[PDB]
Every structure is written in structure tokens, then in C-alpha cells.
PDB file of C-alpha atoms and ligand atoms in Angstrom:
ATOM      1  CA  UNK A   1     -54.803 -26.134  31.941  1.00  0.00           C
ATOM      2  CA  UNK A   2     -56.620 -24.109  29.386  1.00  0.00           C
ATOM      3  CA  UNK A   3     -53.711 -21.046  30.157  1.00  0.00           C
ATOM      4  CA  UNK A   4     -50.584 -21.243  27.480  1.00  0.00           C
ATOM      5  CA  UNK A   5     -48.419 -18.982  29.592  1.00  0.00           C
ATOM      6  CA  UNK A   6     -45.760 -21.299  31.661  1.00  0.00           C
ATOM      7  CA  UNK A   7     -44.719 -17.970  33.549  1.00  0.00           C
ATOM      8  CA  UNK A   8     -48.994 -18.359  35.125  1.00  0.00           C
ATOM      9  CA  UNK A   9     -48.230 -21.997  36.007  1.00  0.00           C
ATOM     10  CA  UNK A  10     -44.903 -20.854  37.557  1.00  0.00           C
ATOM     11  CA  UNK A  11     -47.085 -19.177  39.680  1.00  0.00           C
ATOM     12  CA  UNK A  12     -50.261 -21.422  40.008  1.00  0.00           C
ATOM     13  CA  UNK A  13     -47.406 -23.675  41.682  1.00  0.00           C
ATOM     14  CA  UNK A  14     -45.934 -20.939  43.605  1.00  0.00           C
ATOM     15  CA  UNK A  15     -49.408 -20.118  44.701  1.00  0.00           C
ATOM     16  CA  UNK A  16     -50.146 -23.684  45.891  1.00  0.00           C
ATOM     17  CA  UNK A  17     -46.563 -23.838  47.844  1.00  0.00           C
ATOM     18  CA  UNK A  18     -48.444 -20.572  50.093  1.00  0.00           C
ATOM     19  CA  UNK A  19     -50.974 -23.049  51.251  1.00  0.00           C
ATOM     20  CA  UNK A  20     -48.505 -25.447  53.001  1.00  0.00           C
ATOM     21  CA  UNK A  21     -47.465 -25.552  56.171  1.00  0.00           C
ATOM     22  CA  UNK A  22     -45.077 -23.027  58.014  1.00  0.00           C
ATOM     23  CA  UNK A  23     -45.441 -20.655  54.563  1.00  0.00           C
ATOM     24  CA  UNK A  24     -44.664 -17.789  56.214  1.00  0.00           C
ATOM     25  CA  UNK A  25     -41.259 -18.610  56.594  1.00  0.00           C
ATOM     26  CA  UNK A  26     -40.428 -18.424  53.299  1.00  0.00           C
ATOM     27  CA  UNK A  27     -42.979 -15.264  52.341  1.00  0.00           C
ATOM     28  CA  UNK A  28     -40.834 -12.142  51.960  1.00  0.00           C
ATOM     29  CA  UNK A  29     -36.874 -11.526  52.199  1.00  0.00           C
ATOM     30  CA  UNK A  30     -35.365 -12.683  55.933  1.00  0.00           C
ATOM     31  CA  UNK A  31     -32.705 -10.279  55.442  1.00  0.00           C
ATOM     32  CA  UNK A  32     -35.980  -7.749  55.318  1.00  0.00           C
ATOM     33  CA  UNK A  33     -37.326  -9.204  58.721  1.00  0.00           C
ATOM     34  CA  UNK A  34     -37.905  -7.111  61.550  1.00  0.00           C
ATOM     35  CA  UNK A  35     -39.112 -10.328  63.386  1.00  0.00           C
ATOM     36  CA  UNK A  36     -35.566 -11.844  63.394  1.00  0.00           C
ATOM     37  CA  UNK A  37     -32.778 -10.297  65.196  1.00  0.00           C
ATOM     38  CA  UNK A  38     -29.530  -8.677  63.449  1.00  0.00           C
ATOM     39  CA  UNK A  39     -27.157 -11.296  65.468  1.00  0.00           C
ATOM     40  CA  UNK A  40     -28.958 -13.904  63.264  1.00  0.00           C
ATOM     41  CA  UNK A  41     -29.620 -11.652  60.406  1.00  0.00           C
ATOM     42  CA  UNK A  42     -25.509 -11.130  60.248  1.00  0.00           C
ATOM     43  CA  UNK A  43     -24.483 -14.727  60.325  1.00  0.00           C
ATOM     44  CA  UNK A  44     -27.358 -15.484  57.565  1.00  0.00           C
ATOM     45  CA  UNK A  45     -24.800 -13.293  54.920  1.00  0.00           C
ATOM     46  CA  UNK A  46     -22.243 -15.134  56.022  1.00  0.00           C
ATOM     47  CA  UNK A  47     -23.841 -18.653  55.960  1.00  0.00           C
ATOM     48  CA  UNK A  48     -26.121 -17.499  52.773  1.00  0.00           C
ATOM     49  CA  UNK A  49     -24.359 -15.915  49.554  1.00  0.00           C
ATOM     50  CA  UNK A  50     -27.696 -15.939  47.462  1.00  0.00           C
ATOM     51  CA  UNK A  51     -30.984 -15.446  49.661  1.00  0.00           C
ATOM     52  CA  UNK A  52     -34.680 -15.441  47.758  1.00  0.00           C
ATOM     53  CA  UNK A  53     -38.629 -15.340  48.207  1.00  0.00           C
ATOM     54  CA  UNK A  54     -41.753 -16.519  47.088  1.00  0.00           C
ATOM     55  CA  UNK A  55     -42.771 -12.667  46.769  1.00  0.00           C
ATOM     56  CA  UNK A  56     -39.271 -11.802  44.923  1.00  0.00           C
ATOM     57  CA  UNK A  57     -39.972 -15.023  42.861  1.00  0.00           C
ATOM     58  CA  UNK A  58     -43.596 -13.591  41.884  1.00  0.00           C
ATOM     59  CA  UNK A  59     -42.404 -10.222  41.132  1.00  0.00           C
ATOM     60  CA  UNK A  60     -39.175 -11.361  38.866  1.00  0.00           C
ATOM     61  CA  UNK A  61     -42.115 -13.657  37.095  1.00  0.00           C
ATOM     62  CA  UNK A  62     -44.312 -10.333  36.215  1.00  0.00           C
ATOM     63  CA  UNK A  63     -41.702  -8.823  34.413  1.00  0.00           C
ATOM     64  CA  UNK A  64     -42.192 -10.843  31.479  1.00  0.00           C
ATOM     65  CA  UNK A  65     -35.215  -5.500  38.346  1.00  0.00           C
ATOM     66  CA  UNK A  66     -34.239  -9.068  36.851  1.00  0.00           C
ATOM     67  CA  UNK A  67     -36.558 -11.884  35.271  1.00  0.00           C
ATOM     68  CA  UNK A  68     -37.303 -15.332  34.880  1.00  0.00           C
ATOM     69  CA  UNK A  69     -36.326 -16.502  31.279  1.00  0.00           C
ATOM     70  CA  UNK A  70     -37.925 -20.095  31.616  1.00  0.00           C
ATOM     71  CA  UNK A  71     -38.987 -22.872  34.141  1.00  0.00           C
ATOM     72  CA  UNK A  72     -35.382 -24.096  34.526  1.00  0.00           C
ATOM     73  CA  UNK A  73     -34.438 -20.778  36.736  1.00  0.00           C
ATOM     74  CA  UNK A  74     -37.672 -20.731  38.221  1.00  0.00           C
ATOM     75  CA  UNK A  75     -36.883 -24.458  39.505  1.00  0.00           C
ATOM     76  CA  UNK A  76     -34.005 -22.984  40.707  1.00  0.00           C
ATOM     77  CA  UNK A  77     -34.832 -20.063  42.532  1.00  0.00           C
ATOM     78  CA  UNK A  78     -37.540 -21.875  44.106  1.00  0.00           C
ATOM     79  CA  UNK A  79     -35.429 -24.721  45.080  1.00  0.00           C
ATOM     80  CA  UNK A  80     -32.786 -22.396  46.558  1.00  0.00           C
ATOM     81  CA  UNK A  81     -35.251 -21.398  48.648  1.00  0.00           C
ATOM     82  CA  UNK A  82     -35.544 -24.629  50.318  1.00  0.00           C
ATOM     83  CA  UNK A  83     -31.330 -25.453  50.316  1.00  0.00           C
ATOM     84  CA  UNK A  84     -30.833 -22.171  52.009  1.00  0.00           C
ATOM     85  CA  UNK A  85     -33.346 -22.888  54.971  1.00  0.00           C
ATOM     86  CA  UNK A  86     -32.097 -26.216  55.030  1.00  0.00           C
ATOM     87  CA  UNK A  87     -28.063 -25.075  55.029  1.00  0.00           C
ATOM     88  CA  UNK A  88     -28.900 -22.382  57.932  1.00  0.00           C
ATOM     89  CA  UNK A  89     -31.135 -24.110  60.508  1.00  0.00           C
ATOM     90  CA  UNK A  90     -30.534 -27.533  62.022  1.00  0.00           C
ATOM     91  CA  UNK A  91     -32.377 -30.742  61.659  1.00  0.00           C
ATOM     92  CA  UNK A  92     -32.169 -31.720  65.086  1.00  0.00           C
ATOM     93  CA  UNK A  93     -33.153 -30.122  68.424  1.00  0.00           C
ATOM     94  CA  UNK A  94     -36.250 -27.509  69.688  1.00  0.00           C
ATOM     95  CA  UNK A  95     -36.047 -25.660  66.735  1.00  0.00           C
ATOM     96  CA  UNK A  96     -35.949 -28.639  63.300  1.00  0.00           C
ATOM     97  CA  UNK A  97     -39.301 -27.345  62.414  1.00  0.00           C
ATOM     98  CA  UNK A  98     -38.076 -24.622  60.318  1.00  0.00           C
ATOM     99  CA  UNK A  99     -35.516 -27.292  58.503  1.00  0.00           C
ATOM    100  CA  UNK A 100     -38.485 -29.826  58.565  1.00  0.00           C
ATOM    101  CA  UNK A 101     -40.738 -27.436  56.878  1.00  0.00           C
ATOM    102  CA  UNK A 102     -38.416 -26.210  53.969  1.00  0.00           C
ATOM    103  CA  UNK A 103     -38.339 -30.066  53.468  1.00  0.00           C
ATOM    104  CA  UNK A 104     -41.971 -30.749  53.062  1.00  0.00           C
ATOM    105  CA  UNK A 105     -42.322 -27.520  51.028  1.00  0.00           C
ATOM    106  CA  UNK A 106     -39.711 -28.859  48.725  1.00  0.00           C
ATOM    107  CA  UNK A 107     -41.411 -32.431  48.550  1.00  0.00           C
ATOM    108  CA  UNK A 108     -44.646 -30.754  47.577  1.00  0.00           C
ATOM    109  CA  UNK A 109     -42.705 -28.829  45.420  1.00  0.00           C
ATOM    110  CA  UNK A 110     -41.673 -32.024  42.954  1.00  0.00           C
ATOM    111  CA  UNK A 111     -44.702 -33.369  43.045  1.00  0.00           C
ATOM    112  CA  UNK A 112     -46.538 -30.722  41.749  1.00  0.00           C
ATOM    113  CA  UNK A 113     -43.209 -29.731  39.537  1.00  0.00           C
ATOM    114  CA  UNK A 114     -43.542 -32.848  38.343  1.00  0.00           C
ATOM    115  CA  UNK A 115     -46.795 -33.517  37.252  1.00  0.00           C
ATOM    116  CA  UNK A 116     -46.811 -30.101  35.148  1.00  0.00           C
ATOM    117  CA  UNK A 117     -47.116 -29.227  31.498  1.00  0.00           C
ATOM    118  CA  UNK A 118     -44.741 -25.790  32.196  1.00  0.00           C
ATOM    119  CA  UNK A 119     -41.580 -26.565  30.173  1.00  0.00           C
ATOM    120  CA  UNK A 120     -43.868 -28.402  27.208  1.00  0.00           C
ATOM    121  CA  UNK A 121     -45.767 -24.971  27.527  1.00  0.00           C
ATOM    122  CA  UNK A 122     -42.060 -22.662  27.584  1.00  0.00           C
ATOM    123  CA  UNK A 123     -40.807 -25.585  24.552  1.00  0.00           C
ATOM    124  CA  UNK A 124     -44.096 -24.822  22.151  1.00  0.00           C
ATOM    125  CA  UNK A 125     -43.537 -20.642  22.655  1.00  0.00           C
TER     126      UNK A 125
HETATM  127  C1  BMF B   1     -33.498 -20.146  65.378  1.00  0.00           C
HETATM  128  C2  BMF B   1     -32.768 -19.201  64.460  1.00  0.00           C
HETATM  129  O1  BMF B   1     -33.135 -19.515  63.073  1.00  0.00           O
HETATM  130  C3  BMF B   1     -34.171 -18.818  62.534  1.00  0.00           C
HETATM  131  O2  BMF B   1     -34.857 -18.019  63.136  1.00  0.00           O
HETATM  132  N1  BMF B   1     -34.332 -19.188  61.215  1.00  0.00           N
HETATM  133  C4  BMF B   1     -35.300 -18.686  60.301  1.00  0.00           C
HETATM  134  C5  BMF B   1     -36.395 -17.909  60.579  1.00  0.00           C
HETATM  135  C6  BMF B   1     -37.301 -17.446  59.562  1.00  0.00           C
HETATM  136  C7  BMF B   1     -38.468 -16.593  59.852  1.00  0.00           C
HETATM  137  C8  BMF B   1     -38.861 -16.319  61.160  1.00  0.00           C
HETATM  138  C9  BMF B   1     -39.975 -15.541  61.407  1.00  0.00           C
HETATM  139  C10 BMF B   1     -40.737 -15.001  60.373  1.00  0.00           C
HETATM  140  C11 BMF B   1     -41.952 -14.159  60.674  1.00  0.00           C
HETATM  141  C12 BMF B   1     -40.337 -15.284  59.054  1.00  0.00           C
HETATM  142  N2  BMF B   1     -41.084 -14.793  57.948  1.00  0.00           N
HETATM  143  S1  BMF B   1     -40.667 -13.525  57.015  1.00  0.00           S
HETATM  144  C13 BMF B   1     -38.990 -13.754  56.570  1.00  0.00           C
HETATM  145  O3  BMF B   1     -41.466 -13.604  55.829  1.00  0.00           O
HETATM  146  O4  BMF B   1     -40.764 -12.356  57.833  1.00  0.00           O
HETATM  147  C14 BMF B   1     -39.224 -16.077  58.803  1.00  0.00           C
HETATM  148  N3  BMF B   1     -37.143 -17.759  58.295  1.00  0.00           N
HETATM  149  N4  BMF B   1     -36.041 -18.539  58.029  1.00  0.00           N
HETATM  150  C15 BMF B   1     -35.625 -18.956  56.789  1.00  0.00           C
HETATM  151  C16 BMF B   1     -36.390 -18.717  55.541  1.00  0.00           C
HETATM  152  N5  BMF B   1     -34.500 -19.609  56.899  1.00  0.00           N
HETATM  153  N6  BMF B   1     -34.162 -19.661  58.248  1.00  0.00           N
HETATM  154  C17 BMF B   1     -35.105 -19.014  58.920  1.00  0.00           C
END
């Protein structure tokens, strides 16, 4: 890695995660989206209690207006990310790519997750 900071390979992952497929989607806040409609943008506070972002993620990260304390909330807020898509949108019919995509994004997710030296980086800080 050559880096130190865990917060930088927080967001070398988060970085990589922008890459994959259907990215947009989980970009900036939905509750923020002119795209979507306010019928669907209603339900999604009632379905949703805690939405978040890749670019709310990157700013809280920054910060060094909350912040990430160590990899174990960024895991979270990354992963809730993924549950929330996942608990709104439906895995079957026209529409399962959005649920599909949250899915892959998450896979590629733990793999990189896994493979990382960001909590032996947080441990020796
Ligand atoms: C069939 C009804 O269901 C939905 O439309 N579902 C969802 C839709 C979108 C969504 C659409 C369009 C755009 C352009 C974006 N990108 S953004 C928020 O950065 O402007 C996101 N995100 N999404 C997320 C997360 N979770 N669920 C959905």
C-alpha cells in the first residue's frame, strides 16, 4: 500500500465500488433526487429509517457534520447502503436490476473488504 492512513483505503475501496456497474444509483442522497418522484421519495422514509451515500460516506471520511471513527462504521455505512436498496426494491419482476445491482456492489464490496490491510492499518495508529 505504501499509504498508512486506513481513512485513504476507506476510500481507495469506496473509489473502486464507483467503477461497478449501475454506480449511479448509489452516488448522492435519493431523498436529494430530483430524478425520482415524491410518491416514491415518501414511502422511501417510511420503508428507510437510516438512508446513506457514497458521496456522504466520502465527506464524513474527510473530516478526520459527523465522522468515521474506524473501518468498523465505515463497513457499516457502506453496507447499509446495499441493505437499504435491497429492503426497498424487489428482486423479482421488470425492475430487479436495481436490487441485483446493490447485490453485486456488495459482493465486490467483501472481496475487496476482505483482502485489505485497513483495520491492521486503524490497529497500529
Ligand atoms: C422503481 C421504484 O424504485 C426506484 O426507483 N428505486 C431506486 C432508484 C434509485 C435511483 C434512480 C435514479 C437515479 C438517477 C439515482 N441516482 S441518484 C440517487 O444519485 O440521483 C438513483 N436509487 N435507488 C436506491 C439507492 N434505492 N432504491 C432506488
Amino acid at each position: 500500500e505504501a499509504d498508512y492512513d486506513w481513512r485513504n483505503e476507506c476510500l481507495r475501496i469506496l473509489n473502486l465500488l464507483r467503477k461497478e456497474q449501475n454506480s449511479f444509483l448509489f452516488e448522492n442522497p435519493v431523498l436529494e433526487s430530483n430524478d425520482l418522484t415524491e410518491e416514491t421519495k415518501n414511502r422511501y422514509k417510511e420503508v428507510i429509517p437510516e438512508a446513506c451515500d457514497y458521496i456522504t460516506i466520502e465527506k464524513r471520511l474527510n473530516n478526520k457534520n459527523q465522522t468515521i471513527e474506524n473501518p468498523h462504521e465505515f463497513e457499516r455505512l457502506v453496507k447499509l447502503i446495499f441493505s437499504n436498496c435491497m429492503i426497498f426494491n424487489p428482486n423479482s419482476g421488470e425492475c430487479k436490476w436495481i436490487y441485483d445491482s446493490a447485490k453485486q456492489s456488495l459482493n465486490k464490496f467483501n472481496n475487496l473488504w476482505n483482502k485489505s490491510n485497513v483495520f491492521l492499518l486503524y490497529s497500529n495508529s
